[PDB]
Amino acid sequence: TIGTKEEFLYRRLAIQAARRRTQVGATYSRSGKGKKRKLKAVDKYHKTESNYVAHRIHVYSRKLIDFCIKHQAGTLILMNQEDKVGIAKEEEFVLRNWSYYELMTKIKYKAEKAGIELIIG
DNA sequence: GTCGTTAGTTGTGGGACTAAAGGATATCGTGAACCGAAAAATTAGTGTAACGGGTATCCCACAACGCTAG
Structure with a gap:
């Protein structure tokens, strides 16, 4: 089991909440010197x-590939991924808090590098 | 003759009665009337939709050349 709900979803939402906090607090910050200086604090959370x-996706994909290689698993299968994509599409939290395209593409390129053939279903 | 003493009853009261298992019971009699208490149920009142830039994230597709001449 790679990854925890606290280290991926909770910290992501904590960064989002901090960004909203700074966005709220920027309305009454120093004023009269332009919008850029007001949104200066927002500018910190550029790609946080x-x-x-x-980084967490890289770590998780690396651990998955390491586990598969260490057990000589020549074929890695993602279970019920199509149905989970379908439910995520008709939702809001699942799409905007669970990066599955990034995980899938990292897994695909890091398994096509190691010879593991990846299946989705 | 009379009063305290001692021993032997005599009546009366308080305390015992293996170990092992199990272990169900039924339990009357009725006087009135008003006030207070709190616990409960019923009733009366307020409602959004898209928009400007600008920017945070997601999915989804594609690229990431090779050769010739001045």
Whole structure:
């Protein structure tokens, strides 16, 4: 089992909540010097949670590939991924808090590199 | 003759009665009337939709050349 709900979803939502916090707090910040200085604090969260998500996705994909190679698993199958894509599409939280295209593409390129053939179903 | 003493009753009261298993019971009699308490049920009142830039994230597709001449 690679990844925890707290280290992926909860920290991602914490970064999002901090960004909303700064967005709310920027309305009454220093004013009269333009919009850019007001949104300066927002500018910090440029690619914060994107970087965090990318790093955790890299770690998780690396652990999956390492486990598959260490047990000589020459064919890695994603179970019920089509149905989960279908339910995620007709939702809001699942799409905007569970990067599955990024995970799938990292797994695909890191398994086509190691010879493992990836199946989706 | 009379009063305290001692021993032997005599009546009366308090305390015992293996170990092992199990272990169901039924339980009357009726006087009135008003006030207070709190617990419960019924009733009366307020409602959005898209929009400007600008920017955070998602899925989804594609690229990431090779050769010739001045």
